[PDB]
Amino acid sequence: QISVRGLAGVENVTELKKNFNRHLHFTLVKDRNVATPRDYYFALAHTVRDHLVGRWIRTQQHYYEKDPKRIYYLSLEFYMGRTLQNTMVNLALENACDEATYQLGLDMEELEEIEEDAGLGNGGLGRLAACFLDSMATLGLAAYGYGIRYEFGIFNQKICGGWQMEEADDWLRYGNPWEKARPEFTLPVHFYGRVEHTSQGAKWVDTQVVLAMPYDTPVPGYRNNVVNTMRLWSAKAPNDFNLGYIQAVLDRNLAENISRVLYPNDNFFEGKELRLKQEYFVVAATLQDIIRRFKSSTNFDAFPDKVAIQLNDTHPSLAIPELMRVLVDLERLDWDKAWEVTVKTCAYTNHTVLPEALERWPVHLLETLLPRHLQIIYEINQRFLNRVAAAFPGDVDRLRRMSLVEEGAVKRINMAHLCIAGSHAVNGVARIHSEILKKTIFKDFYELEPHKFQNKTNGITPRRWLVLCNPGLAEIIAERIGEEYISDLDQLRKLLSYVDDEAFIRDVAKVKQENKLKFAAYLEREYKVHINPNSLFDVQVKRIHEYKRQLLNCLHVITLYNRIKKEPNKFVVPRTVMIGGKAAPGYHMAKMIIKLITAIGDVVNHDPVVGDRLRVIFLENYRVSLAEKVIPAADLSEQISTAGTEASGTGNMKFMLNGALTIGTMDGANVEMAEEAGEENFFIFGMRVEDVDRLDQRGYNAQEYYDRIPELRQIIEQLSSGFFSPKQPDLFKDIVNMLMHHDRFKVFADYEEYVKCQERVSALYKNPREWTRMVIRNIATSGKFSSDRTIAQYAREIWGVEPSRQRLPA
Amino acid sequence: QISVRGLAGVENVTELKKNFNRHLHFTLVKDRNVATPRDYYFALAHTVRDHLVGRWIRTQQHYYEKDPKRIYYLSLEFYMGRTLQNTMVNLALENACDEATYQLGLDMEELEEIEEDAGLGNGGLGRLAACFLDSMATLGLAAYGYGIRYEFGIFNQKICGGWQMEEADDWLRYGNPWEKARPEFTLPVHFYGRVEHTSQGAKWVDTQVVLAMPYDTPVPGYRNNVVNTMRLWSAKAPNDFNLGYIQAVLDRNLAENISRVLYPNDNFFEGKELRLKQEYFVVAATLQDIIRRFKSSTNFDAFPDKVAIQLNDTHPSLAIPELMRVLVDLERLDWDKAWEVTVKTCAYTNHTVLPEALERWPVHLLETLLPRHLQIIYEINQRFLNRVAAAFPGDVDRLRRMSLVEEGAVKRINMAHLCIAGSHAVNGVARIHSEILKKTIFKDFYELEPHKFQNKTNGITPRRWLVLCNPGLAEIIAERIGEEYISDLDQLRKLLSYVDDEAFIRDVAKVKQENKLKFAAYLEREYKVHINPNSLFDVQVKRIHEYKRQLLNCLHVITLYNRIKKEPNKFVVPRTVMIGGKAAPGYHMAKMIIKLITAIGDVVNHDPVVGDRLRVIFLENYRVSLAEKVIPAADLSEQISTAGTEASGTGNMKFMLNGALTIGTMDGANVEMAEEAGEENFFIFGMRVEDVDRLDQRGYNAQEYYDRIPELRQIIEQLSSGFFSPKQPDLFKDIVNMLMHHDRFKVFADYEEYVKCQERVSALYKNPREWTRMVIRNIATSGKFSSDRTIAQYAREIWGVEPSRQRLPA
Ligand SMILES: OC[C@H]1O[C@@H](c2c[nH]c(-c3ccccc3)n2)[C@H](O)[C@@H](O)[C@@H]1O
Ligand SMILES: OC[C@H]1O[C@@H](c2c[nH]c(-c3ccccc3)n2)[C@H](O)[C@@H](O)[C@@H]1O
Ligand SMILES: *Cc1c(COP(=O)(O)O)cnc(C)c1O
Ligand SMILES: *Cc1c(COP(=O)(O)O)cnc(C)c1O
């Protein structure tokens, strides 16, 4: 059908069809007369997977021949989503498979919808790991993703009476055709025990053994014939484990619980033992694997020339004391040499400045679970503080602040401090965030080792986030400037010379309308709701958080509703306001915000005076595959975090790439996005970081805003009196009380500027031609936000490897 | 190589090799330079499995077209062993696969040894189910095996310091290529709740839901192109299950525990809730499946014309009240009509008369777990006892004895009584056992419904138990009389005309010597022990039990040792005494017997005066794949149960088929085996059932035997004084005390006759020609003990279906 989906050669289509029927018969043991769509999806998955295998074997082969430096990306999260369409895109099989399935009387798009999301992540951090693996494969780096094969990923979200209910994401029920179990590379992981000191150093003894069994998933690069590996570990009990008899066998579950379930907190720290076990489990098994591979080429001087370990936040911070333990206790290197190797090997990416997200593990936990790692952490701390003392003599305050050990009722290890001490590079994930790390939480560390601190602004893979999710847009771009841009997104600047072309303006606007029609129909089919596709699609999709200020959006929505009721017969630009996202199950306030959003929807969507002029939709079960549907359908992207709270964001970039205008604060990567496009092409409002600081010094009094803004007072009165909760008048008292007395994120401080800025959005939407010209200026400058740029920068400035766009042979 | 292994056609071998390399590349994602023997085994398994698939699909297809009466074999146990060689035998692929693997530079026998036993059974009962499925497929019956996919089968047995240690049988670690998950046929199973009575009858409400997910394993018939299905259910939690969040997800394990582990008791009842859950789980899911299949052809009059349900012991007895519950509560049949359907559908196989093995479930357990089933059991009991009262007026004693409810401190349901009431046929498993059921435990039931009681003498599949395990013997037989006998074992009688043929005598004796050389070498390689292959191989392999009297064997072994020490320089026929078997983990006395066997071995095997004249070996981890090795190597089969305790036995038949002479009691199928061969061709000794009864009436005084037999007194003195346990003199006090005061199985009563009979065995072994002529008379009359005979009898006399030996098309 479309050019960027590749060729459907007669030979190719014939072979896909005979192999589809082969898998249906032999692999699935079905005849055509009993096959369900699920069977047909599986037969297609096995057929496409067959095209990965030779390329996978040859890539791993080639890395053995060439022995390049190897990148290990350690993350507790890989938010992969569906694999089938991504695999077809990267192997140029998409049109062939469409043709092949079409001729067997099947609709490939219908089969794609059967695949479960691999939801092994919470949001931005997990999805950044998935975009990174894609770019690492596309740039020909000998890169391995290492994490945990959770049996249960991020929970499925149901709305019941407007409340979030959680249910278990049983993503493996029907099998995962993409993974290959490697039970032959199973490795022991140790817990508990105690430390004996002998003549020949320290010995970790009387430990509990859990087995780590790896599952390999292929990561195909974009048409370069490179297939990298994501290795995920699964917890297994040893067979002599607990070994009356029956109970011992049933108690195997205690050990296997380690890999059972993803912790569902976004940008929040829960200090639970099971979480600590997950962190050690992935680090211990991964480092044994790294070292085994290194030794198959006594001398660890060359370790950092052959190995880079990237730490995705502090979650795998124990890689630092673990590497020391292996090098000192088992390989018998002296401390100083082992430490040199560790620092040149490890690099740390910080993702947040929110204090409630920073990992601070109680010492009693580490003491019981990892007694040796705690001894090593104490030794790191002493030698680290001896360097601080020598550089800043007499600055006892500095020693206290920089300590890896925090004093208090309970002593804690500051895992961020451990990561900075033990890494040659510390990076933030957007320029403003990296600047904030050097001015505030890590100022002391910056003054000691300025050279360690870098910026690597986040990116998104334009394969998933344009070609895959928005083929129509990819095609009209490819008509004008060709296909090269998909692996070189900077080429999108060539589109600035089409900003006054009538045909291109028409085509950009037609694709957006087609995406909106397609999304509006998806809503009717799967969730019986009737949206006006001529309306402006105002979309805020991200995890539910106070700092992301869904509540600010709620205040705008209620303002639009109150303005319609005041002057019913006046023209307003019609809007579909769509808000979606999961709350962490224990985050009470996030669960209350979901309930308020649906409560507003119940009043607004059933007011006859409002008509189709204002619709409020809560998008259920927001996940990667729903993002692929709604982001191409969006006109306005809502990026409205309090300045200084959103480290980067990556939703922001997805919408920029897909032809939505951004209303946002100068927060995270919003700042670089406005710089790339021009501020006049961005709906910027509200406090800068500097303004938030001034308000904090003076003191935030929400009452002042309530007393000065009648429109805002009216909304707070509506919430309090039960306008939005007639049966339970007091339902939202916790929300009002927080906004008036305990708002860390200063929602009222940005209310007036937000509403005025939303009026400018409405005004521009009335002029479709100028709306679309501004869209083109955004798409055309979105090239910086490719994760290919991000990874090339990690590779050159941190890992010391040169990316490559050259094909491996097929 | 040998004719009964089929043809190795040039076309066939070429295709096996290209498909082996296809699976190695695409299925296993390995190149040849990294493949382990385990990879090569898997590539061969996937290649052979490809030959099953078309035949499997067409067989299930054919049963839909023809809609024959369908047999459902319900068992908690299927002791399948390895599948690879059995599949090749039944598809005639064995020589082709040998040739194909040979040309790729691999030894097929080495790859066969990598396959894990499917050990989803304890011993005789589980293995009878496996032999039955094979014969049902071979006789073209539309038969389904239904059971539980245990994650852990019968435990692996390690000997440590001569003690049994148990470790978890993790048989799925590396994957099962033979099974096909069918998550699309997942069915709900209900537990707990309560009963509401409404206008429209009883309703089971507020239940806990566990999901049953089926796994299908193919059961190929012998060269008839029939492939039947074994469906095993796995416990899965529903996704709203327990639905703070983390703990709810981890608590899913409580529901999935149902299918976690096989209860490892042979011929013993443990009244545990988890065991009761396993029994209902398999019955509830199976009956929904049976009924779904029946409805795809309102009218249940024809149910028994389309459905037979065979109950393998009382373990699935709840099929009776469950079928009633479905027919009455859900389908709204009247009681009387539903009961008629149930009785004509169900048949019950009894496997034991040992009181400690009979299932008697406490009422409080059924009351909590299955409240409705208990109401139905009470209703069955009342109507059943009303028939007894009418047939035997005034016989109140009879009413008490026949009740399904036993009175006592705790009330119990007698599941055997439930099975007889609810079945049109009750069978024992050997003629003497079936006679004992009518004279003793079921005399009352026999007098009410004489017509229900049948015999179906057990059998073994000559595919696994001759062709597969003893190709050399199968071949020399096939040289004389052809291949037909493999599916018609009665044809072995034609061998009686070769009993005076010198060439055949030579060939029978050569195969036995080759099997002994091969077994002796297997012992050295895997367990560093040096046996004389010229010695008589005296083998007792079976579960460790008091009733099976391994202790009697021990007393003989110690007698031979004491006779050598008394007269060191006298000639004795050399013996390798091999005893093997697992004890149930909680069976203290069985664990003590293992320790005594190894304690005897430590004294005997290290006495220089003994030399290679007497060796005592404990065969570790006795299981199906060890039986396939040791049974062909055996000269003497030990079947020495107290008369009336061994319902049938099936080990006895395996050895008869494989050229061993039997020393045994007139117990179980030993009686029919001696009748078939002639008593003069059998080493029969000891009390008959009648003699045991006489001793019981008089009273068993073990002291009398100890006082009258000096040789026996000496052995008991050795055990007591620590001759066999120098470091712990009192180690065996429990064994002596039981033999002297509490021996239910009368070991001393059979000691003198056993030793004298063992002297006759030694005397015949000195005359190899006459030993082998007696072996030929045994092999030649073993045809009755084919499970093909057994199943043809079940089919004609119970299920009302005609077996067939006609090929399906390929
Ligand atoms: O860099 C990837 C994205 O990372 C997110 C993040 C921080 N911290 C976490 C987390 C923390 C604990 C457990 C799970 C996730 N996730 C930031 O909030 C985004 O601003 C940024 O875009
Ligand atoms: O009929 C199959 C064989 O069945 C055995 C049996 C009875 N009972 C049991 C059992 C009982 C409970 C749990 C597991 C197994 N297993 C008899 O002991 C043999 O004599 C006979 O050969
Ligand atoms: C990209 C993405 C995110 C991150 O979005 P932000 O707006 O940066 O919070 C979260 N969830 C999913 C499913 C995503 O695809
Ligand atoms: C046949 C068999 C049995 C039953 O043997 P008996 O002598 O009848 O107790 C037990 N275990 C295995 C592994 C078998 O193959």
Side-chain angles (χ1 to χ4, degrees), chain B residues 41-62:
Chain B
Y41 155 64
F42 269 112
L44 183 64
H46 285 278
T47 300
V48 168
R49 183 201 101 120
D50 281 347
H51 290 254
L52 277 169
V53 160
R55 282 158 169 102
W56 204 11
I57 290 174
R58 287 200 92 100
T59 303
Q60 295 312 301
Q61 185 100 36
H62 180 257

Side-chain angles (χ1 to χ4, degrees), chain B residues 210-418:
Chain B
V210 175
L211 293 181
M213 171 173 315
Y215 288 74
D216 291 354
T217 303
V219 186
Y222 185 68
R223 326 225 162 156
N224 58 354
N225 299 324
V226 166
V227 185
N228 286 342
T229 306
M230 185 180 59
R231 182 159 273 179
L232 300 177
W233 300 104
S234 197
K236 250 249 185 262
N239 290 358
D240 62 351
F241 193 68
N242 292 127
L243 285 163
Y245 168 78
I246 295 291
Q247 192 57 54
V249 174
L250 298 180
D251 287 349
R252 292 171 62 92
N253 291 326
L254 281 51
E256 302 181 344
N257 281 340
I258 292 166
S259 65
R260 188 82 65 208
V261 61
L262 169 75
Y263 274 81
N265 306 313
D266 184 277
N267 211 358
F268 184 78
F269 175 57
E270 210 187 338
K272 295 289 152 64
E273 195 196 30
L274 178 58
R275 173 59 171 201
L276 184 56
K277 286 189 178 157
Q278 286 182 342
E279 285 176 1
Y280 184 58
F281 180 74
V282 59
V283 149
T286 301
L287 262 156
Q288 270 172 81
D289 224 23
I290 282 171
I291 287 175
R292 186 261 314 150
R293 196 170 282 121
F294 170 73
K295 286 185 174 195
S296 306
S297 306
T298 31
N299 196 247
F300 289 90
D301 296 324
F303 197 78
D305 295 331
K306 286 320 199 176
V307 177
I309 297 167
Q310 196 64 37
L311 306 179
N312 202 25
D313 218 280
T314 56
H315 309 150
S317 61
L318 286 166
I320 293 164
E322 175 67 7
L323 183 43
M324 284 295 284
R325 186 184 72 80
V326 173
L327 291 188
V328 168
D329 294 353
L330 302 183
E331 298 295 346
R332 293 293 192 218
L333 273 54
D334 82 281
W335 185 278
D336 293 326
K337 173 65 71 181
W339 185 243
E340 204 207 332
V341 167
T342 299
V343 165
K344 293 174 54 160
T345 296
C346 295
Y348 160 61
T349 306
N350 174 265
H351 297 267
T352 195
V353 300
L354 292 197
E356 59 265 43
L358 298 185
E359 287 195 299
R360 292 151 56 260
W361 285 110
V363 161
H364 70 255
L365 255 179
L366 293 173
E367 205 183 315
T368 303
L369 198 66
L370 301 166
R372 180 58 184 151
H373 290 81
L374 185 61
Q375 293 181 345
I376 281 155
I377 289 167
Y378 280 148
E379 191 63 38
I380 289 169
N381 196 41
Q382 193 169 27
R383 289 159 182 270
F384 184 65
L385 291 184
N386 283 334
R387 288 170 63 205
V388 174
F392 299 100
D395 194 355
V396 297
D397 212 294
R398 191 185 280 267
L399 295 180
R400 187 202 86 252
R401 291 198 301 276
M402 287 182 82
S403 182
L404 278 58
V405 188
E406 282 175 18
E407 299 300 339
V410 307
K411 296 173 62 175
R412 303 163 180 288
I413 307 305
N414 191 318
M415 304 310 275
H417 293 180
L418 172 61

Side-chain angles (χ1 to χ4, degrees), chain A residues 694-763:
Chain A
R694 262 154 86 247
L695 236 191
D696 273 336
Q697 286 150 37
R698 193 163 76 245
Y700 179 59
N701 182 35
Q703 188 68 43
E704 194 184 282
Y705 295 92
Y706 171 100
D707 292 331
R708 283 173 182 184
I709 314 160
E711 285 208 303
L712 180 62
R713 194 183 321 124
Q714 178 184 5
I715 295 172
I716 297 317
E717 290 188 328
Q718 280 174 314
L719 285 186
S720 291
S721 64
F723 185 82
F724 290 102
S725 50
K727 289 308 211 288
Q728 299 138 106
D730 79 316
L731 179 66
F732 294 122
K733 69 172 168 58
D734 288 348
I735 299 191
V736 168
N737 182 62
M738 179 272 281
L739 283 171
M740 298 291 278
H741 305 116
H742 308 105
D743 186 9
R744 292 166 62 214
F745 307 103
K746 307 186 163 56
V747 173
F748 292 175
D750 280 334
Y751 170 78
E752 264 200 314
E753 272 247 324
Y754 182 51
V755 174
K756 285 176 187 183
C757 182
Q758 285 278 26
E759 284 171 19
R760 300 206 289 107
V761 170
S762 281

Side-chain angles (χ1 to χ4, degrees), chain A residues 173-377:
Chain A
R173 170 161 292 194
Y174 294 97
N176 177 9
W178 305 111
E179 79 192 354
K180 186 60 182 77
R182 301 293 199 194
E184 61 273 27
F185 296 95
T186 299
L187 293 176
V189 171
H190 297 260
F191 295 96
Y192 301 105
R194 54 179 185 93
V195 179
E196 282 168 16
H197 290 98
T198 71
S199 310
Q200 288 281 144
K203 259 165 57 66
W204 190 18
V205 299
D206 302 340
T207 59
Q208 268 172 50
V209 175
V210 175
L211 293 181
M213 171 173 315
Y215 288 74
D216 291 354
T217 303
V219 186
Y222 185 68
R223 326 225 162 156
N224 58 354
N225 299 324
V226 166
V227 185
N228 286 342
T229 306
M230 185 180 59
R231 182 159 273 179
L232 300 177
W233 300 104
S234 197
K236 250 249 185 262
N239 290 358
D240 62 351
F241 193 68
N242 292 127
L243 285 163
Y245 168 78
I246 295 291
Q247 192 57 54
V249 174
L250 298 180
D251 287 349
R252 292 171 62 92
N253 291 326
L254 281 51
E256 302 181 344
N257 281 340
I258 292 166
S259 65
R260 188 82 65 208
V261 61
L262 169 75
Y263 274 81
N265 306 313
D266 184 277
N267 211 358
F268 184 78
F269 175 57
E270 210 187 338
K272 295 289 152 64
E273 195 196 30
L274 178 58
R275 173 59 171 201
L276 184 56
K277 286 189 178 157
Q278 286 182 342
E279 285 176 1
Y280 184 58
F281 180 74
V282 59
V283 149
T286 301
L287 262 156
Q288 270 172 81
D289 224 23
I290 282 171
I291 287 175
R292 186 261 314 150
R293 196 170 282 121
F294 170 73
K295 286 185 174 195
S296 306
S297 306
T298 31
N299 196 247
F300 289 90
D301 296 324
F303 197 78
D305 295 331
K306 286 320 199 176
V307 177
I309 297 167
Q310 196 64 37
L311 306 179
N312 202 25
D313 218 280
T314 56
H315 309 150
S317 61
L318 286 166
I320 293 164
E322 175 67 7
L323 183 43
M324 284 295 284
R325 186 184 72 80
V326 173
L327 291 188
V328 168
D329 294 353
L330 302 183
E331 298 295 346
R332 293 293 192 218
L333 273 54
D334 82 281
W335 185 278
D336 293 326
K337 173 65 71 181
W339 185 243
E340 204 207 332
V341 167
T342 299
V343 165
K344 293 174 54 160
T345 296
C346 295
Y348 160 61
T349 306
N350 174 265
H351 297 267
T352 195
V353 300
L354 292 197
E356 59 265 43
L358 298 185
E359 287 195 299
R360 292 151 56 260
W361 285 110
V363 161
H364 70 255
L365 255 179
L366 293 173
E367 205 183 315
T368 303
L369 198 66
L370 301 166
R372 180 58 184 151
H373 290 81
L374 185 61
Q375 293 181 345
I376 281 155
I377 289 167

Side-chain angles (χ1 to χ4, degrees), chain A residues 22 24-31 33 36 38-39 49-51 53-54 56-57 61 151-156 166-170 172-175 180 182-186 211 213 236-240 243 245-246 249-250 252-254 256-257 260-264 270 274 585, chain B residues 22 24-31 33 36 38-39 49-51 53-54 56-57 61 151-156 166-170 172-175 180 182-186 211 213 236-240 243 245-246 249-250 252-254 256-257 260-264 270 274 585:
Chain A
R22 189 177 53 79
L24 183 71
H25 192 74
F26 292 99
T27 309
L28 298 186
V29 192
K30 284 291 165 76
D31 71 56
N33 300 134
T36 65
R38 172 166 283 96
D39 295 311
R49 183 201 101 120
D50 281 347
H51 290 254
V53 160
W56 204 11
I57 290 174
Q61 185 100 36
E151 181 172 328
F152 300 100
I154 186 60
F155 65 84
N156 282 313
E166 297 89 31
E167 76 174 34
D169 173 35
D170 195 5
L172 299 181
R173 170 161 292 194
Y174 294 97
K180 186 60 182 77
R182 301 293 199 194
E184 61 273 27
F185 296 95
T186 299
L211 293 181
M213 171 173 315
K236 250 249 185 262
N239 290 358
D240 62 351
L243 285 163
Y245 168 78
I246 295 291
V249 174
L250 298 180
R252 292 171 62 92
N253 291 326
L254 281 51
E256 302 181 344
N257 281 340
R260 188 82 65 208
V261 61
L262 169 75
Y263 274 81
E270 210 187 338
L274 178 58
Chain B
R22 189 177 53 79
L24 183 71
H25 192 74
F26 292 99
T27 309
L28 298 186
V29 192
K30 284 291 165 76
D31 71 56
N33 300 134
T36 65
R38 172 166 283 96
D39 295 311
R49 183 201 101 120
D50 281 347
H51 290 254
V53 160
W56 204 11
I57 290 174
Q61 185 100 36
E151 181 172 328
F152 300 100
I154 186 60
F155 65 84
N156 282 313
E166 297 89 31
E167 76 174 34
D169 173 35
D170 195 5
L172 299 181
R173 170 161 292 194
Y174 294 97
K180 186 60 182 77
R182 301 293 199 194
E184 61 273 27
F185 296 95
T186 299
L211 293 181
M213 171 173 315
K236 250 249 185 262
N239 290 358
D240 62 351
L243 285 163
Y245 168 78
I246 295 291
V249 174
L250 298 180
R252 292 171 62 92
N253 291 326
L254 281 51
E256 302 181 344
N257 281 340
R260 188 82 65 208
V261 61
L262 169 75
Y263 274 81
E270 210 187 338
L274 178 58

